[PDB]
Amino acid sequence: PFPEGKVLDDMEGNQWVLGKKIGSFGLIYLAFPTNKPKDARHVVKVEYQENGPLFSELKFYQRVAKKDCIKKWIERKQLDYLGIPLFYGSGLTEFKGRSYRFMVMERLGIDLQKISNGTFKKSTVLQLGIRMLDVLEYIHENEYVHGDIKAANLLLGYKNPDQVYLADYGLSYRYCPNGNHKQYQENPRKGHNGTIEFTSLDAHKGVALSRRSDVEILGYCMLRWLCGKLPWEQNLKDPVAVQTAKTNLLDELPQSVLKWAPSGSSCCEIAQFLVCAHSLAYDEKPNYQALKKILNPHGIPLGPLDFS
Ligand SMILES: Nc1ncc(-c2ccc(S(N)(=O)=O)cc2)cc1-c1cc(F)c(O)c(F)c1
């Protein structure tokens, strides 16, 4: 890999020093700015090899993760925070005989899969959804969809673990380049992509991801976080079976969702959400404010995330 203490030059002038390799479509290191540098509050993602998939993810961060754009959006929407990892820059570095691409990103805490089976308090499941909706509205406005929401790609902040961040934009897609929404085409060859437990129906058919697909995956997530299981989990080996089960579930809403819930818990809000989500056309803009009203109907403001 790359040795500790290596100095990297971003394309905005800045210099960064590598830290410990904290695991790994690219390698992840802790990062320190040389200027006004204690504990690492930055992270570096470095390309695995020549001509890799970093480009996709790199493009997204450069295009939409800039702090300027975010701070402006937060003011316009009156939001407390927006769960996108801050992007500090990217550049080129030479290891051995060739150049490599690296990203510099805000440091984050632990992911949700590690925290909790995977069952959280209902209050928490709903808040996670509401937070994810804000992130989705913003990225969707910027012509991009995530495509892989799951517990593993939601991370708490390092400095503030009260706040949560959607991570891992590798499988992200530009659905609306330059205001031109993609056409609908089913492709069996480019089919069943993403995490099978939560991938959208459009993904099962090889249709290019559009905004609704993100909303659908979130609904699946929230159901799994609340119930601890999904109907299709028994037969993940057959992706087609999974598509069938997802179709069935949505075809028979809301009882299908309601029946799934374990005694003593309710999936009422989640069932409505999937109802609202499954109503959408391929090119339709989700009603983010209605979806958020669904997950927090009373209108009491959100409290701190609870992982007790
Ligand atoms: N921004 C981040 N901050 C912290 C970690 C991290 C924390 C703890 C641990 S660990 N094993 O618990 O020590 C490992 C990694 C990872 C990312 C991150 C890496 C990527 F490659 C992404 O694409 C991405 F969106 C996010």
Curated annotation (Swiss-Prot):
| UniProt keywords, alphabetically | ATP-binding, Cytoplasm, Endoplasmic reticulum, Host-virus interaction, Kinase, Membrane, Mitochondrion, Nucleotide-binding, Nucleus, Phosphoprotein, Serine/threonine-protein kinase, Transferase, Transmembrane, Transmembrane helix
Catalysed reaction(s)? L-seryl-[protein] + ATP = O-phospho-L-seryl-[protein] + ADP + H(+); L-threonyl-[protein] + ATP = O-phospho-L-threonyl-[protein] + ADP + H(+)
Kindly state the tissue distribution recorded for this protein: Isoform 1 and isoform 2 are expressed in various tumor cell lines. Expression of isoform 1 inversely correlates with ERBB2 in breast carcinomas (at protein level). Widely expressed. Highly expressed in fetal liver, skeletal muscle, pancreas, heart, peripheral blood leukocytes and testis.
Catalytic residues, per the record, are D148
The UniProt note on how this protein's activity is regulated states:
RAN inhibits its autophosphorylation and its ability to phosphorylate histone H3.
Write out the GO cellular component annotations: cytoplasm; endoplasmic reticulum; endoplasmic reticulum membrane; mitochondrial membrane; nuclear envelope; nucleus; protein-containing complex
Signal sequence residues: none
Q: Which GO terms describe its molecular function?
A: ATP binding; protein domain specific binding; protein kinase binding; protein serine kinase activity; protein serine/threonine kinase activity
UniProt EC number: 2.7.11.1
**Which leading EC class covers this enzyme?**
transferase
Biological process according to GO? cellular response to oxidative stress; DNA damage response; protein autophosphorylation; protein phosphorylation; regulation of interleukin-1-mediated signaling pathway; regulation of MAPK cascade; signal transduction
Q: Which residues form the Protein kinase domain?
A: 16-301
Tell me the residue numbers annotated for binding ATP.
I22, G23, S24, F25, G26, L27, I28, K45
Q: What does this protein do?
A: Serine/threonine kinase that regulates several signal transduction pathways. Isoform 1 modulates the stress response to hypoxia and cytokines, such as interleukin-1 beta (IL1B) and this is dependent on its interaction with MAPK8IP1, which assembles mitogen-activated protein kinase (MAPK) complexes. Inhibition of signal transmission mediated by the assembly of MAPK8IP1-MAPK complexes reduces JNK phosphorylation and JUN-dependent transcription. Phosphorylates 'Thr-18' of p53/TP53, histone H3, and may also phosphorylate MAPK8IP1.
- Family that this chain belongs to: Belongs to the protein kinase superfamily. CK1 Ser/Thr protein kinase family. VRK subfamily.
What subunit structure does UniProt give?
A: Isoform 1 interacts with MAP3K7, MAP2K7, MAP2K1 and KSR1. Isoform 1 and isoform 2 interact with RAN and MAPK8IP1.
State what protein this is by name: Serine/threonine-protein kinase VRK2
Where does this protein come from, organism-wise? Homo sapiens (Human)
User: Top-down, what is the taxonomic lineage of the species of origin?
Assistant: Eukaryota, Metazoa, Chordata, Craniata, Vertebrata
Q: Which residues of the full protein are shown?
A: 14 to 326 of 508
